[PDB]
A paper describes a structure:
Ribosome biogenesis is a highly coordinated and complex process that requires numerous assembly factors that ensure prompt and flawless maturation of ribosomal subunits. [name] has been identified as a bacterial cold shock response protein required for the efficient processing of the [name] 5′ end during the assembly of the 30S ribosomal subunit. Here, we report cryo-EM structures of 30S assembly intermediates accumulated in an [name] null [name] strain. Cryo-EM analysis of Δ[name] 30S particles revealing the accumulation of two predominant classes of early and late intermediates allowed us to suggest that [name] participates in two stages of 30S subunit assembly and is more deeply involved in the maturation process than previously thought.
The structure of immature Δ[name] 30S subunits belonging to the second most common class D (30%) was resolved at a 2.7 Å resolution. Here, the densities corresponding to the head domain and helix 44 were also completely missing in the cryo-EM map of this class. However, in this case, the entire rRNA density was present in the body and the platform. Local resolution analysis showed that in the particles of class D, the body is the most defined region, whereas the platform is less well resolved. The densities for the proteins S11 in the platform and S5 in the body were fragmented and the densities for S21 in the platform and S1 were completely missing. These results indicate that in this intermediate, some parts of the body and the platform are still not completely formed while helices 1 and 2 have already acquired mature conformation. The second type of Δ[name] 30S intermediate with missing density for the head belongs to the second most populated class D (30%) and represents the particles consisting of the platform and the body with well-resolved PK and helices 3 and 27, and missing h44 and h45. The absence of the head domain, which, apparently, was just starting to fold, and the presence of structured central PK in class D intermediates indicate that the pseudoknot formation occurs before the start of the head domain folding. Indeed, the smeared densities for helix 28 were detected only in earlier intermediates of classes A, B, and C with unformed PK; the fragmented density for this helix appeared in class D with folded PK and a full-size neck helix was found in late intermediates of classes E (12%) and F (39%) in which the head is anchored to the body and the platform. The acquired data suggest that the intermediates belonging to A, B, and C classes could precede intermediates of class D in the course of 30S subunit assembly.
Residue numbers in the entry:
A (entry chain K): 12 to 106
B (entry chain R): 19 to 68
C (entry chain P): 1 to 82
D (entry chain F): 1 to 100
E (entry chain O): 1 to 88
F (entry chain L): 1 to 123
G (entry chain D): 1 to 205
H (entry chain H): 1 to 129
The structure:
RNA sequence: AAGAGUUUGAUCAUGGCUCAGAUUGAACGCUGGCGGCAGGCCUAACACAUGCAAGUCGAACGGUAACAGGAAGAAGCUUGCUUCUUUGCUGACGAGUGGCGGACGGGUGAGUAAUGUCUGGGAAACUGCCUGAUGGAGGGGGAUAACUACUGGAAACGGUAGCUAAUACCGCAUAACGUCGCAAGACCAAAGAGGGGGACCUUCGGGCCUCUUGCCAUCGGAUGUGCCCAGAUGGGAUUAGCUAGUAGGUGGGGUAACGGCUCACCUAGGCGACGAUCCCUAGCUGGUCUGAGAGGAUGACCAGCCACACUGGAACUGAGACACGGUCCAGACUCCUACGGGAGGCAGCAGUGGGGAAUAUUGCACAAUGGGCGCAAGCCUGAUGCAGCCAUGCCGCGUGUAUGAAGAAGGCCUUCGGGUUGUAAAGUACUUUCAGCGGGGAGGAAGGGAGUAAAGUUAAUACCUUUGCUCAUUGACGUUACCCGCAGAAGAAGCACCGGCUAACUCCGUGCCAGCAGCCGCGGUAAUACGGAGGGUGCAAGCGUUAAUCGGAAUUACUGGGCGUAAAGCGCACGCAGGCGGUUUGUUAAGUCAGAUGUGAAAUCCCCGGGCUCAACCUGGGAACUGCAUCUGAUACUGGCAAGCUUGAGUCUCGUAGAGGGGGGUAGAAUUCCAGGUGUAGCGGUGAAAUGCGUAGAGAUCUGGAGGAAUACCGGUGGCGAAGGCGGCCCCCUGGACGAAGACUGACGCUCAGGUGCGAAAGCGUGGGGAGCAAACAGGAUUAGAUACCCUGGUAGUCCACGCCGUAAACGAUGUCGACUUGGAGGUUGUGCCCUUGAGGCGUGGCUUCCGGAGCUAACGCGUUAAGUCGACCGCCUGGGGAGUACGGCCGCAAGGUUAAAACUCAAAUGAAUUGACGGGGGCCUUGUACACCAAGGUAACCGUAGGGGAACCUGCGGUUGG
C-alpha cells in the first residue's frame, strides 16, 4: 500500500487466537490475518503451531505491500510466543 | 541524606519504565528504602521518570 | 405448776425412771426444766437403784414445786437409808 | 510556620508567563507572612511520559516556609491555573534551607 | 497536637510552680484543653473513628485525675473544677 | 473458677438423669399390659425376643421385657414391672415381675427358681 | 444358725486340718484328704489373691464354728478395740465360751463343746450360761454342772485332752471338772498358722 | 509483685532455685525482712542483707544442699483473695512438721512451732518445706 | 452502753430518724473469703442531728415505730 | 358433742350477756366524760370523770376489764381534763 | 483417701455410661423354727359406718330420780318374821345450778421461704393452779335453773305461768402496800364449807370454842405466754423495679404490753443488683444416712418449736383459745324429715372404703408412770402400760453329738480300672437347748385402808396433822421371767451362684433357636455363659431382684478442676459499681488473735463403766457439741484514719519510624464505548460444538472524550492499628507507639458484671452511580437425564453519601495486667560508648521471626512474645444428639440477630499419635485424610451472608489451615 518497508506488527497474542495487525509507523493497518477460522477452530488451538501459522498468514497478508521490516509490539501473552515471533521474522522482517 | 531532587543517584535505583528494583540485591538499610520509593514515586508524579 | 415427777425411760418391762423437774402440763417424758436423779425399780442388789441429788429438790421445792407421790415416797426411802 | 518545598513544572506553552506567575506567588506568600528561604530553577527539562501532550517543562521549585493555611490558597490557584498542571509541595520535618 | 508553648503557659497558671508538669492540676488542665480542641475539630470529620479512641482516653484520664483530687484533697478539687470549669 | 466468681454464682450440682423415669422412686409398679408383641434385638444378636407394652398406674405407657423361657400373658393382663434394661432396641428399661400378679413362673424351671416366680417342687 | 453338714469335707477344702472331727482315728486315716471335696478336686488350686484371703478367713470361721454375721461383728469389735485388728479378732474368737469349753478338755470337739454349752451343762462363775458366743473374761471359773458331771462323753472328752497340748492361758481341773480362764491368750500361744492379716485385709477396703 | 509482693518473694526464691541462681533479689519491706529472718534463723536459706535507703533491695542468698535447693516447695497461702487465719489449736502442721509454715501472729511474724509454743494463732504467710 | 453498733448515716430524710448502714466483714462460710456484708437499720434521733456520711453510735431500744428499734447515742464523726 | 361442752356453751352465752351489759354501761360513762371534754366544759367533765371512775374501777376489780385498762382510761381522761383546764 | 469394666489395629488421653460398698419406714420372688428389742400409710390434708379418746366435785347448792339403809306408821302377826305408806332421816346419788378441767395430753404436716425455725441478745408485758409476805374476810338484796301447771315442734329444739338455793349474781360498808393524780384527794374487794366439842348460852336451829380448808387485796417467786432485734436458714433475673398506713412525724384511740396496731393531720419517704418485688419448692431443729474428711442427701421413729383441725370468715368465754372431739355464718359434702325443718366433720385410737409396689387389732388394763377433778376414798384417761399382727430391722439361739466304710445301695462322671457324692448315711452309743407337757415361781408395788403416841395443835380429852408399829390388802401383762420334771433326735433349711472380673465345673439337652446378660459378652452341633443333672461355692432363717441415697466420682474440683488441638478465652475496646492494692511512719482496733465468762435442752454419737444368761437393748459418768455472745488484752497482718516516700502510674521537654485513621482534589497503568480512518473474513469458545459478534467494516492501530474498578514495581519472614483491618502522590487534622534523658506529681493502679462504643464480607433500607464484573436471571450442549461442568449476555449488589445490620475458621482456635526464670540464630527499628569517615566495635531500649534447654504436656508442641513459675480480676466449660433449636424477653426496615431451654434419645461422642495400606506431587529412601487391622481420585475442608432450588447442591462477596 505504501511500500515503505517499515512499520510494526502488533501481535495481539491472546490465549485462544491472535489477530496480528500490520500497521505502519503512521498507525494505519496494512493487512490483517488470524489463526482461528483461517483454517482451524477448536479447543486444540492455543498451541505453538497455531501461533506459527498465524504468523505466516499475517506475513503473507502483507508480503505484497513491499514491507520487509516489521517491528513487534505484542499485546498480552499468547501461546507459542517464540513460535509466532520466529515464523513472522523468518518471512524476511526486522523487529 | 537521600531525597527526591537528587535525580543523578536515582537512575542507579530504577529501570527504563520506572519499576522499583527490589532491595534484595542492593541493600538499603530498609529505612533508606522507604525514602527511596517515596522519592522515586514523587519523581514519577514529578514527571521526570515514568 | 412445777412438779418433781418421774419420766419412764428404759426398755419394755424394764422401766428406768428419770426424776425430772418439769411443768405439770408437759408430756410425762416431754419438755422438762431439769433432771434431778434417776430411779431403777428393777435394779440388782449391788446396783444403785436410786440417786436423787436432793439439794436441787430442796431448791425447787422452796420455789413452790409439788412432788409426785412416787418421788415423795422415794425421797423418804433415801432419807431413811441416809 | 515551617519549611515547604513548592515544586512545579512550567510548560513551554505556559513559559510565556514565568516571571509574572512566579513573582505573583512570591508576593502573595510574603503578604501571607511567609519568607522565602531558597530559590532555584532547573530549566526546561524533558518529560519521560508525554503527560498533557507536551515534552518540555521549565521546572521551577520555589521552596518557601509556610504555615498550615497559607498553602491552601496557593495550591487552589495551582489547580485553577493552567501554568502548572500538577504542583507539589513538601513538608520539612527538619530545618533545610539550601537548594541543590 | 496542642502547642508546646500552651503546655508551658498552662503549667505557669495551673501549676503551683515551674517545671511541675507532673502536678495533678497541671495534668488535668492540659488534658481538658486537649479534649476541648478535639471537640472543636470534631464537627469537621465525625466520620473518623480511630482518632476518637485517643479522645476517649483523654476524657477518662482527666476524670481519673479529678477523682484523685477529690479523694485526696476536697478543696483543691472543688476549686479547680471551677477555675478550670470542669465537672459541669 | 475464681473464688470471687464462685461467691457470685456457686458451683451447682448436675442432676441425676433419667434411668428408670417411669417409676417415681417405687421398687415396682403395676401395669395393664396393652399389647404383647415380639421384637427383634440389635445387630450382633438374634432370636426375636418377647416384650410387652404396659400402661402404669401413674399414667406412663412403657415397654417391658417379659423374660423367662415361657410366657402366658395377654392383651389386658395386670402385671408388676421392675427396673432392669435389656440390650435390645432402645427403650426396654423395665422387666416384668415373673409370677406376681397376672403372670406366672416359667414352666419346669429348677434353678434360679425365685427369679421366675416358680415354687419349690415338693420332691 | 449352725453349719450342720459333712465335717471332713469342710476341712478338705481348707487344705489343712481343722479340729472338727476330733478323736482317735487320726483323719487321712479316718477319711481321704489332700483333695478338694468334689468331683473335680484334682484340679490345680491356683487361686487369686482374693481366693487365698477368702480361703484363710473361711478356715478361721470353720475352726470355731462361727458364721459370717458374727464373724464380721468380731471384726468390727477388733477394729474398734486397741491393738492390731488381727490379734484382737483372734483373741475375741478365743475367749468365746464354746471354744474355751473345748480347750479345757471337757468337750471332745468344738461342736461337742457347743452341744454341752447349749444343753445347760456349763456354769460360768457358778451360774449356768448356755450361750455359745458368751465371751469368757479373765478369772472366770468355767465348770460342768454337777447334774452333768457323770456324762460318759464329758469323761471321755477329758482323756483325749492332753494329747492336745495343754493350753497355757487357762488352768482346767480334771478330777473335779472345772477350769479358770486366767488371761486372754496371746498370738504366740494360739497354736496355729492363722494368717490373720489375710482376714484383716479381706475386711479392709 | 504488683498486688502480692510476698508471693513475689516466694516466686523469686523458687525461680532462682530451680534455675540455680546464687542469690535472688527484690525490693525490701519489713515483712519481707521478717520472713527472710525466719527462714534463715531456722535455716531454709543462708543469709540476707538490705542495701540503700530510698529503694532498698534484699540480697537474699539461696542455700543448696548438694546441688538441690534446701527449699523444696515454698507456697503462698494467704493471698489477697483468701486471707487465711488459723487459731492456735488449728495451726497447720506442714509435711509432718518437717516444713515450716511461717505464720503472722500478734507477736510478730514467726514460725509454726514458735506459735504453738507461744500459744497463739494468726495469719499463715507461706508454707515452706 | 449495752452493745452500741457503730455505723454510717445513709439517709436522714424522714423526720427524727435516719437510716444507718452497719458494715461488717464476715468470712464466707464455704469459700473462706472475707466479704463485706451491710446492715441498713432505721434509727431514731429526735434532734435530727445526723447527716449523710456521719459515723454514729446506735443502741437498741424498744420499738419506736414499725421498722424502728435502734436509737442514736453519739455522732462520732460529723462528716462534711 | 361432749356433755361439758354443751354446758360451757350455755354458760358462755349467759356470761356473754352479763358482760355485754356491763361493758355497754361502762362505755356509756366513759363516753359521757369524753363528750363533756369536747364541749370544753371543765367542771362538767370533772364531775363526769368522778361518776365514771368507780364504774371502770370496779369493772376492772371483778375482771370484766384488766386493771391496766382502767388505769388507762383514768390517765387519758385526767390528761384531757387538765389540758382543758 | 481416692475399684473393676466400658470409645482404639494398638496407645495415650478427654469423657460419659454400667456393676462392685454402705444404707432403707422399703417393696417384690422363693423359702421359713424360736426368742429378745425396736419399727410399722413414705401414696389420698381422700371420704369416713361403728365403738371408744374429758371429766370430776354432795366437803359449793336446791335437791332426791335411783339404789340402800333406816326411822317409824299401818298391816299381815312368825313376837314382831315380813308387806304397804310416810320420812332425803342417812349412805349415796340421776338430772339441774355452781367450781375447776375441757387452751393439757393425742393427731397431722396442708399451709408457711421467713417476726416460722435455729443461735444470740432485748424491753414495753401479762401469767389459773403452785409458792413466800402483809392485810382483810362487815352487812344486805334481787334473781334464777331445777321443780310445778300448762303448752308448741315430726324431730332438733322449745314458749308461757308460778317456784326457789348457793362458794351464782348485785349493791352497801371497808380501803393501802393498790389505781389515778404534781400533790391534795378521789376511787376500788371478798364466801363459805367441813370435822370435832369442854364449859356456857341457846329462841334447842344453832350460838360459842378450836382445827382444817377455802374466799379477797397487794407485793415478790417460780412457771408459762406475748412482744422486739441481729445473724443464719431453698430455687428461679426466660421475675428489676416494688411500696401510698406505704416510710417517718405529731396527736386521738386501742392493747396485758411496745408498735401504723389504728385514725386525723403532716411530711415524702421506704425497700432494691449485699437480689427488692414476683414465681416455684418447702414445716424448722436436735439429729439420721453417707463420706477419709470437706460435703451431699435427708428431717420416718424419739425430743424441742411452729402450723393446722371439712373449706372460708368471725368472735365469745376464759388466766390462757380466735379452741381437733366449743359457738356463730358462709359454703361444699353426707345423713334425718311429717319436706316445715334438723344433724355432722377419724390430721385421737381402732376400723372401713379408696388409692397404692406397700404398711397391723373395730384387743386388755388403768396394776405402773403421768394428767384432770376430788379433803380423801375415788372417778376419768385409746396418754400410757401391755398384749395382737408383720423375717420390716437388729441381736441371740436352735434344727443335734461322738463314733463308724464292707469307703454300702444308689446318683453323677467313667480315659471302664474305677471315681465321686463320702464319715455322708445307715448301725452304733450319748445329749435334750428351744418347741411340747407337768410342777413350781420372781420382779415390776410404791401405795392406799384398818388399828396403834407426841399437851403436835388447842374446849387440854376430842377432831385433824405427823411420825409410832400391827393387821389385811392392790399386777393388765400373766398358764411372766426363770427354775423342775418327762418323752423322744425326736418337732425344725433354704436361697443365690459356679467363662473372667468373682469364691466355685463336669455331663446331657439345645442348636444364633430357645434363651441368658452388671460388664465383657455367650448360642448357628456342644456351650464349664442357655436350660436340666451331678458336683461344688456363698450366705443361711434367710437368700435373691428391684428402687432410692451417698460413695467410687477429685465426674461442680473451698479442701480438690479445667478453657491452643478433647466442652470451654467474649470479635475488639473503654469503663460503672465490685474484687484486688508499692512503701515508711503515727493512730484505731474493725477483721484477726489470746484470755475469761455466759451459753450451745435432753436424747443421739464417742470413751469408760453397770444391768439384762450373752448380744441387741437399757443405763451411769465423762467427753463432745468444733457454735454464738460478751468482756479484757495484743498490734504482726488486712481494714479505717493521719502524715509522708518514689520505684507503680502518670505530666513535660526533645527526637524517631510507620499500608494508623479522616478530609479533599490528585495523575497515570489498564478499562469499554464513542469519535474515524487504516480491513475484510472472520471475533468467538468448550468434553465437543454451540450460543452469541461480524462482512451493514468486524479484531488490532494511533488519534482525542468519558468513568471506575486498583494504585503494578515498591511489597517484606516489612510496617501500623485494640480487633475487624490498613498500600498513588500532595497537603490539612489527628491518633497511637517508641528512644533520650530531665523536671515534676506522688499509689493518682490493675481488672471489671451490668453499660457504652468500634466491628470482615454478605445483607438490608435510603438516593445516586454504573468502564468491566456478576449472584439471581435470561441462549447453546451437557448427562444416567442437566436446573452437570461449561461458553454468551445480564440485574441487584459490588462503587459513592447516609442509616440499619452485629456477623465470621472475627483464629496465636492461646482474656487482661504485673513479676520471675538456661540459650541460639534472624529480622525490625531506636539510642549510648569508643573507630568522632559512613557503616564500623562494644552496648543499651522496644518490636518481631525461627530453633532450643529446663520447665510444662495426653501427645503434638510451648519454651524469657510461655502452653514454665506465680499473683489479681474477668469471661467461659461439665458425655453425645436434641440444639445455639423451641419458648419467653430483648433488639431490627425486615432479613434476622441476641439470651436460651425442655421433652425425648444413644452409650458412647472426642482429641493426639502411631504400624502400614491407595499413595496417579521425587530422586533404598517422600507423604496425607480416610483407611486397614479413600487431603495429588468428573472437579480442598469449612465458617459468615445472599440468591436459585423438593432438597442438598450449586453459585456469588469475605475469611481460615482444622489440606
Amino acid at each position: 500500500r505504501k511500500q515503505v518497508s517499515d512499520g510494526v506488527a502488533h501481535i495481539h497474542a491472546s490465549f485462544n487466537n491472535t489477530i496480528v495487525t500490520i500497521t505502519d509507523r503512521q498507525g494505519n493497518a496494512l493487512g490483517w490475518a488470524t489463526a482461528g477460522g483461517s483454517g482451524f477452530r477448536g479447543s486444540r488451538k492455543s498451541t505453538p503451531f497455531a501461533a506459527q501459522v498465524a504468523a505466516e498468514r499475517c506475513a503473507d497478508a502483507v508480503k505484497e505491500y513491499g514491507i520487509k521490516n516489521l517491528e513487534v509490539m505484542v499485546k498480552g501473552p499468547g501461546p507459542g510466543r517464540e513460535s509466532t515471533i520466529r515464523a513472522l521474522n523468518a518471512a524476511g522482517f526486522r523487529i | 541524606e537521600i531525597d527526591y531532587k537528587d535525580i543523578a543517584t536515582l537512575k542507579n535505583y530504577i529501570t527504563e519504565s520506572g519499576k522499583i528494583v527490589p532491595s534484595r540485591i542492593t541493600g538499603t538499610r530498609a529505612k533508606y528504602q522507604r525514602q527511596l520509593a517515596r522519592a522515586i514515586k514523587r519523581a514519577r508524579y514529578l514527571s521526570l521518570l515514568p | 405448776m412445777v412438779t418433781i415427777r418421774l419420766a419412764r425411760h428404759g426398755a419394755k418391762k424394764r422401766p428406768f425412771y428419770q426424776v425430772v423437774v418439769a411443768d405439770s402440763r408437759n408430756a410425762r417424758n416431754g419438755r422438762f426444766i431439769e433432771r434431778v436423779g434417776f430411779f431403777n425399780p428393777i435394779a440388782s442388789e449391788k446396783e444403785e437403784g436410786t440417786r436423787l441429788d436432793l439439794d436441787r429438790i430442796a431448791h425447787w421445792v422452796g420455789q413452790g414445786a409439788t412432788i409426785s407421790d412416787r418421788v415423795a415416797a422415794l425421797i423418804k426411802e433415801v432419807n431413811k437409808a441416809a | 510556620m515551617r519549611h515547604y518545598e513548592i515544586v512545579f513544572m512550567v510548560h513551554p506553552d505556559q513559559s510565556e508567563q514565568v516571571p509574572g506567575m512566579i513573582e505573583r506567588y512570591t508576593a502573595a506568600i510574603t503578604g501571607a507572612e511567609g519568607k522565602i528561604h531558597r530559590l532555584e530553577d532547573w530549566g526546561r527539562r524533558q518529560l519521560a511520559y508525554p503527560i498533557n501532550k507536551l515534552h518540555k517543562a521549565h521546572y521551577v521549585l520555589m521552596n518557601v516556609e509556610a504555615p498550615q493555611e497559607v498553602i491552601d490558597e496557593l495550591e487552589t490557584t495551582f489547580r485553577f491555573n493552567d501554568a502548572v498542571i500538577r504542583s507539589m509541595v513538601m513538608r520539612t520535618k527538619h530545618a533545610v534551607t539550601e537548594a541543590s | 497536637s496542642l502547642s508546646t508553648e500552651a503546655t508551658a503557659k498552662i503549667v505557669s497558671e495551673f501549676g503551683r510552680d515551674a517545671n511541675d508538669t507532673g502536678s495533678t492540676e497541671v495534668q488535668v488542665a492540659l488534658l481538658t484543653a486537649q479534649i476541648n480542641h478535639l471537640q472543636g475539630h470534631f464537627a469537621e470529620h465525625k466520620k473518623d473513628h480511630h482518632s476518637r479512641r485517643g479522645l476517649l482516653r483523654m476524657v477518662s484520664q482527666r476524670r481519673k485525675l479529678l477523682d484523685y483530687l477529690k479523694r485526696k484533697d476536697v478543696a483543691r478539687y472543688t476549686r479547680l473544677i471551677e477555675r478550670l470549669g470542669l465537672r459541669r | 473458677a475464681t473464688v470471687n466468681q464462685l461467691v457470685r454464682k456457686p458451683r451447682a450440682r448436675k442432676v441425676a438423669k433419667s434411668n428408670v423415669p417411669a417409676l417415681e422412686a417405687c421398687p415396682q409398679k403395676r401395669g395393664v399390659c396393652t399389647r404383647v408383641y415380639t421384637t427383634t434385638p440389635k445387630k450382633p444378636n438374634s432370636a426375636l425376643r418377647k416384650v410387652c407394652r404396659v400402661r402404669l398406674t401413674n399414667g406412663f405407657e412403657v415397654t417391658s421385657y417379659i423374660g423367662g423361657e415361657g410366657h402366658n400373658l395377654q392383651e389386658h393382663s395386670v402385671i408388676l414391672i421392675r427396673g432392669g434394661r435389656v440390650k435390645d432396641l432402645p427403650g426396654v428399661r423395665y422387666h416384668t415381675v415373673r409370677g406376681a400378679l397376672d403372670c406366672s413362673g416359667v414352666k419346669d424351671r429348677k434353678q434360679a427358681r425365685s427369679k421366675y416366680g416358680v415354687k419349690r417342687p415338693k420332691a | 444358725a449352725r453349719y450342720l453338714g459333712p465335717k471332713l469335707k469342710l476341712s478338705r477344702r481348707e487344705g489343712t486340718d481343722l479340729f472338727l472331727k476330733s478323736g482317735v482315728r487320726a483323719i487321712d486315716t479316718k477319711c481321704k484328704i489332700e483333695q478338694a471335696p468334689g468331683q473335680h478336686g484334682a484340679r490345680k488350686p491356683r487361686l487369686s489373691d482374693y481366693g487365698v484371703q477368702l480361703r484363710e478367713k473361711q478356715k478361721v470361721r470353720r475352726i470355731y464354728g462361727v458364721l459370717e454375721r458374727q464373724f464380721r461383728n468380731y471384726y468390727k469389735e477388733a477394729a474398734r478395740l486397741k491393738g492390731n485388728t488381727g490379734e484382737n479378732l483372734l483373741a475375741l474368737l478365743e475367749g468365746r465360751l464354746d471354744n474355751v469349753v473345748y480347750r479345757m478338755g471337757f468337750g471332745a470337739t468344738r461342736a461337742e463343746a457347743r452341744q454341752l454349752v447349749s444343753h445347760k451343762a456349763i456354769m460360768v462363775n457358778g451360774r449356768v450360761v448356755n450361750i455359745a458366743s458368751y465371751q469368757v473374761s479373765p478369772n472366770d471359773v468355767v465348770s460342768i454342772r454337777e447334774k452333768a458331771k457323770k456324762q460318759s462323753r464329758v469323761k471321755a472328752a477329758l482323756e483325749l485332752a492332753e494329747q492336745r497340748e495343754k493350753p497355757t492361758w487357762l488352768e482346767v481341773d480334771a478330777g473335779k471338772m472345772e477350769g479358770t480362764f486366767k488371761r486372754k491368750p496371746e498370738r504366740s500361744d494360739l497354736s496355729a498358722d492363722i494368717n490373720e492379716h489375710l482376714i484383716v485385709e479381706l475386711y479392709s477396703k | 509483685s504488683m498486688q502480692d509482693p510476698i508471693a513475689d518473694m516466694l516466686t523469686r526464691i523458687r525461680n532462682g532455685q530451680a534455675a540455680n541462681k546464687a542469690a535472688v533479689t527484690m525490693p525490701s519491706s519489713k515483712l519481707k525482712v521478717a520472713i527472710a529472718n525466719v527462714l534463715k534463723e531456722e535455716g531454709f536459706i543462708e543469709d540476707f542483707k538490705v542495701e540503700g535507703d530510698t529503694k532498698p533491695e534484699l540480697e537474699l542468698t539461696l542455700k543448696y544442699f548438694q546441688g538441690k535447693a534446701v527449699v523444696e516447695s515454698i507456697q503462698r497461702v494467704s493471698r489477697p483473695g483468701l486471707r487465711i487465719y488459723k487459731r492456735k489449736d488449728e495451726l497447720p502442721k506442714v509435711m509432718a512438721g518437717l516444713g515450716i509454715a511461717v505464720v503472722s501472729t500478734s507477736k510478730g511474724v514467726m514460725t509454726d512451732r514458735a506459735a504453738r509454743q507461744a500459744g497463739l494463732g494468726g495469719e499463715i504467710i507461706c508454707y515452706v518445706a | 452502753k449495752i452493745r452500741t453498733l457503730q455505723g454510717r448515716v445513709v439517709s436522714d430524710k424522714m423526720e427524727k430518724s435516719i437510716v444507718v448502714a452497719i458494715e461488717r466483714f464476715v468470712k464466707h462460710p464455704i469459700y473462706g473469703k472475707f466479704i463485706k456484708r451491710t446492715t441498713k437499720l432505721h434509727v431514731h434521733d429526735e434532734n435530727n442531728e445526723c447527716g449523710i456520711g456521719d459515723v454514729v453510735e446506735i443502741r437498741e431500744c424498744r420499738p419506736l415505730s414499725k421498722t424502728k428499734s435502734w436509737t442514736l447515742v453519739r455522732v462520732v464523726e460529723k462528716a462534711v | 358433742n361432749i356433755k361439758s361442752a354443751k354446758k360451757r356453751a350455755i354458760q358462755s352465752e349467759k356470761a356473754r350477756k352479763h358482760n355485754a351489759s356491763r361493758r355497754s354501761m361502762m362505755r356509756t360513762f366513759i363516753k359521757k366524760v369524753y363528750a363533756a371534754i369536747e364541749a370544753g366544759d371543765k367542771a362538767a367533765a370533772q364531775k363526769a370523770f368522778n361518776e365514771m371512775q368507780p364504774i371502770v374501777d370496779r369493772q376492772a376489780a371483778k375482771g370484766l376489764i384488766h386493771k391496766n385498762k382502767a388505769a388507762r382510761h383514768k390517765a387519758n381522761l385526767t390528761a384531757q381534763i387538765n389540758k382543758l383546764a
